[PDB]
Amino acid sequence: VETISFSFSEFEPGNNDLTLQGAAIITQSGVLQLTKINQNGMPAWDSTGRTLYTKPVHIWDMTTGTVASFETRFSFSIEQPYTRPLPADGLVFFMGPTKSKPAQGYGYLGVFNNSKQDNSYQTLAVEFDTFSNPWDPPQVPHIGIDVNSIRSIKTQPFQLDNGQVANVVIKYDASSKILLAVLVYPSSGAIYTIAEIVDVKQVLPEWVDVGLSGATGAQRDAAETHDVYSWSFHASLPE
């Protein structure tokens, strides 16, 4: 069995196990600020930032036909400090082709280039979307399972606990082809779940990068924090 796993209980600046793209920085206190926080402590609009795990993950093999099972977990907080305009745009965990660079910001969350359903993306993502774009359901925030498109195949509305920490669990079972995501707010005890059938060999390349991305909006103060406090991942490819 070919397995790979990492576990960041906090984030430390400088360590070359994570690549920081765009606006993403790691604070001295250990927080991954995906999008920019101004000097006054307020989130900046027109910001996009990602991080990628530096080593690639073997997810499936075309010769042997085997598909890996995987699971990722992270804790994040989104603080929306303004009533007007609406906050934007969200954060997302995404898996796709290696050596990728930040795509379009705003409602494309740094992962996609437009709203088109296109297999050439080769990207699977679980989004936590805070702004209702024309391709979105009306309710925000919502969890979404994104398969080669920012237009989710499945969405689940959830109520933001503004400024508080959420715990995310995402798991894929290759035998059932079930992709599963759970959000828990320890502050309130709220639990949200979403699941859908994802055939990974049809979606992802054989080797992928895993990463996290966030984006703020396209007009002044259409913004919110996208802080991540911890991140772990594990995959096991049968041989």
Ligand X SMILES: OC[C@H]1O[C@@H](O[C@H]2[C@H](O)[C@H](O)[C@H](O)O[C@@H]2CO)[C@H](O)[C@@H](O)[C@H]1O
Ligand Y SMILES: *[C@@H]1O[C@H](CO)[C@@H](O[C@@H]2O[C@H](CO)[C@@H](O[C@@H]3O[C@H](CO)[C@@H](O)[C@H](O[C@H]4O[C@H](CO)[C@@H](O)[C@H](O)[C@@H]4O)[C@@H]3O[C@@H]3OC[C@@H](O)[C@H](O)[C@H]3O)[C@H](O)[C@H]2NC(C)=O)[C@H](O[C@@H]2O[C@@H](C)[C@@H](O)[C@@H](O)[C@@H]2O)[C@H]1NC(C)=O
Q: 14 vs 41, which CB is nearer to Na ion?
A: 41
Q: 61 vs 161, which CB is nearer to Na ion?
A: 161
81 binds ligand Y (CB under 6 A): no
Nearest CA-CA partner of 170 in 70, 57, 53, 72: 72
100 binds ligand Y (CB under 6 A): yes
Beta carbon of residue 44, minimum distance to ligand NAG (angstroms, whole number): 23
114 binds ligand Y (CB under 6 A): no
Distances in Å between the alpha carbon of 28 and those of 1, 12, 13, 137, 215? 37, 7, 7, 37, 22
Number of residues that bind ligand NAG (CB under 6 A): 5
Q: How far apart are the first and last CA of the chain?
A: 5
Which pair of tokens denotes residue 61? 């093999």
Give, for 201, the enclosing helix (H) or strand (E).
helix 200-203
Q: Which residue is nearest to Na ion (CB)?
A: 163
Nearest CA-CA partner of 130 in 222, 192, 227: 222
Stretches 85-93, 135-143, 164-172, 228-236: which one binds ligand X (CB under 6 A)? 85-93
Q: 121 vs 131, which CB is nearer to ligand NAG?
A: 121
Kindly tell me the burial class for residue 12, based on how many C-beta atoms sit within 10 Å of its own C-beta (0-12, 13-18, 19 or more).
exposed
Q: Is 129 annotated as a binding residue?
A: yes
Q: 20 vs 195, which CB is nearer to a second copy?
A: 195
Q: Using CA atoms, how far apart are residues 102 and 115, in angstroms rounded to an integer? A: 16
28 binds ligand NAG (CB under 6 A): no
Q: Using CA atoms, how far apart are residues 73 and 4, in angstroms rounded to an integer? A: 14
Q: Using CA atoms, how far apart are residues 140 and 132, in angstroms rounded to an integer? A: 6
Beta carbon of residue 37, minimum distance to ligand NAG (angstroms, whole number): 27
Q: 52 vs 143, which CB is nearer to ligand NAG?
A: 52
Number of residues that bind Ca ion (CB under 5 A): 5
Which residues make Cβ contacts (< 8 Å) with residue 119, sequence separation at least 6? 148, 203
121 binds ligand NAG (CB under 6 A): yes
Q: Tokens 């828990």: give the residue.
A: 184
Q: Which of residues 32-71 bind ligand Y (CB under 6 A)?
A: none
User: How far, rounded to the nearest angstrom, does the alpha carbon of residue 80 sit from its chain's CA centroid?
Assistant: 18
Q: Is 70 annotated as a binding residue?
A: no
Q: Is 6 annotated as a binding residue?
A: no
Residue 144 partner contact from Mn ion, ligand X, a second copy, none using kind-dependent CB cut-offs of 5 to 8 Å? Mn ion
98 backbone dihedrals φ, ψ, rounded to 5°: -70, 165
Q: Which residues sit at the interface with Mn ion, rule CB under 5 A?
A: 129, 136, 144
Q: Which residues sit at the interface with ligand NAG, rule CB under 6 A?
A: 103, 113, 118, 120-121
- Residues annotated in a binding site: 127, 129, 131, 133, 136, 142
Q: Which residues sit at the interface with Na ion, rule CB under 5 A?
A: 77, 163
